[PDB]
Amino acid sequence: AEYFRDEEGQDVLLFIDNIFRFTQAGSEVSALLGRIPSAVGYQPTLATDMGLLQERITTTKKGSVTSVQAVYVPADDLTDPAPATTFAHLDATTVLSRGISELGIYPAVDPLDSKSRLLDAAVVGQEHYDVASKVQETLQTYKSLQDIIAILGMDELSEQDKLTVERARKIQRFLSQPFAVAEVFTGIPGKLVRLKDTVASFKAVLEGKYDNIPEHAFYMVGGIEDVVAKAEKLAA
């Protein structure tokens, strides 16, 4: 990658997989190197070693490298030191959670646990920001109310809350998109949805201009056109 970045002077798009294996590997040979094991058996040089890898990857004047690094979070405990050390070092975190996968939502991305450096209102544009801010509040509300729905039921919630819950369930399955590489896994044609188009389509939903659409007509759709089309299909 350095050769590409520097000498060929081109942009790159690095990918490394799975970087927990990188941590783990170093931990093992640390032990063999005779160093007194550090916390949760990780190498005592973990920080600097991770640091050397990450620091080496950067966008210089010479080139630009867009790394995407997979990380395996052992037993989905991000509090474990190996993910936690990596967690700081990476610019644009994305968490893929067991629960969301289990909900049958593929991507498995955890919506309220996805933070990116560039997400700032100016950077992504005010409209993008505002739309996404509304999504975040709605989903977070849905989660807070989820416990209440669990014991009390949905009938004891506010009228406003009940509409918010209904939108949240719709939004939850509006996230679903079938992958192009899961024309093998699910055999459902993949979708590439333009950024502007997504902002617009989510805006409509939030405005409730599709509160006459059933929940399953948001499942594994694409754009706005698709939400409507799958509603018509289901209606039959």
């Binding site: 936690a84 967690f87 700081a88 975190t93 933070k115």
Partner: protein, 102 residues
Amino acid sequence: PGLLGRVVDALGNPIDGKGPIDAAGRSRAQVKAPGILPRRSVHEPVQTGLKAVDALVPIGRGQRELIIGDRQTGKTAVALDTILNQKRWNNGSDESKKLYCV
């Protein structure tokens, strides 16, 4: 005094390359804390420009209040805001109101 506007590495070399450091001493880093008698009670305000911080947990000068919080919540952003507000007081010529941030 002259380390203002210098991004320097730990050694002391400018890593922003703003040339040789203007400095009036080189001092040991193993230097000790100021004695019981050399302290005075804190009472001089400092305003961080954050409404909640300034009212709910007011901060004074020479204070050592922790900022302990959840991982990568742009923890540094909350802190950085304090530095920015110091521009208002700093711009002024009253040396009581000049906080030279590090």
